[PDB]
Amino acid sequence: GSALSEIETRHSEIIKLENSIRELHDMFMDMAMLVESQGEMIDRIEYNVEHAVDYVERAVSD
C-alpha cells in the first residue's frame, strides 16, 4: 500500500513518460532522415536548373 504503491504509481507514470519520449525521438529521427533525403533530390534540381540556365542564356546573345 501507500509506501510501495506511491512508488509503483510513480514508476508506471514514468513508463508513460518514456514511451512519449520514445515516440518523440522517433519522430525527430525520421524527420532528419527525410530532410536528409530531400536535400539530395533538391541539389539535383539545382543541377537541372543550373544547366537549363547555361543553355538558354547562351542561346540568345547576338
Partner: protein, 34 residues
Amino acid sequence: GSNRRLQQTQAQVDEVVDIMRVNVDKVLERDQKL
C-alpha cells in the same frame, strides 16, 4: 510534489509530439512535391 513536476513534464512532451506529427505531415507533402 515533484510528482506535479512530472505531470508537467509529460504535458510538455505530449505537446511537442503533437507539434512534430504535424511537421512530419508537412514534410510528407514536401517530399511528395519533389
